Design a protein around this ligand. Structure first.
Ligand SMILES: Cc1cnc(C(=O)O)n1Cc1ccccc1
Ligand SMILES: [Zn+2]
Ligand SMILES: [Zn+2]
Length: 231
């Protein structure tokens, strides 16, 4: 069963095996007097590990690596951040010290230096245009357009039919659009369309925060989004 926010103390991290060689990592943070859960992803690449997004803060990313060691005891060598926000780059310093090579798109890199967040070192080339996809070891990287942020990336794992959609994708239980200041509300739904059309074969959909479902998470997020739009 999936770890829920009401089951994880701020400062601990859980791993949830989704397939052979595919985990998610779950963590928690307080922010504006409330507690939220956060996801990210782990994919096995032969003998190395590929880490998708941080665990929302220095401390949690330290735990995230320690729980990787306890439970998989394979090394994390590359890290991709899927947008410039703290729940995705909070802890890039802890990874880099640990000898992890951290990556993001140049748009992510720019926006992070501007917001004062931690900056992935390497720049992922070839994703600046909506629809763009590049390979990266055991996953595909996809820029669906602007959405939750202008720079947000989705990750598909083909071996396992897994779609990591990040904060661009909401969990079902989440019916309010929240704070979406960095978002393009006008393009967000077109952007989800692109996700659907490029990965219809997805069987396991992971949001930035909360419980995983399937492609129906995309109709859901289109809906919540289009209902904010119309406030
Ligand atoms: C605080 C935070 C970080 N990332 C997000 C988001 O919407 O992606 N949010 C807002 C959020 C997250 C989870 C549940 C509700 C609101
Ligand atoms: Zn965000
Ligand atoms: Zn988020």
């Amino acid at each position: 069963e999936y770890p829920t926010v009401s089951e994880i103390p701020v400062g601990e991290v859980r791993l949830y095996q989704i397939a052979d060689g595919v985990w998610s990592h779950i963590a928690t943070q307080s922010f504006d007097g409330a507690v939220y859960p956060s996801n990210g992803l782990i994919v096995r690449d032969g003998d190395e590990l590929l880490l998708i997004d941080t665990a929302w803060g220095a401390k949690n990313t330290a735990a995230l690596l320690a729980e990787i060691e306890k439970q998989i005891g394979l090394p994390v060598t590359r890290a991709v951040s899927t947008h410039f926000h703290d729940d995705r780059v909070g802890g890039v310093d802890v990874l880099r010290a640990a000898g992890v090579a951290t990556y993001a798109s140049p748009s992510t890199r720019r926006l992070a230096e501007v917001e004062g967040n931690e900056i992935p070192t390497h720049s992922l080339e070839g994703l600046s245009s909506s629809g763009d996809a590049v390979r990266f070891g055991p996953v595909e990287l996809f820029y669906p357009g602007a959405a939750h942020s202008t720079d947000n990336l989705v990750v598909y794992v083909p071996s396992a039919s897994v779609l990591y959609g990040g904060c661009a994708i909401y969990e079902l239980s989440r019916t309010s659009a929240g704070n979406v200041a960095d978002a393009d509300l006008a393009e967000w739904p077109t952007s989800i369309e692109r996700i659907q059309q490029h990965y219809p074969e997805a069987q396991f959909v992971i949001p930035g925060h909360g419980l995983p479902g399937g492609l129906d998470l995309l109709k859901h997020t289109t809906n919540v989004v289009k209902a904010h739009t119309n406030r």
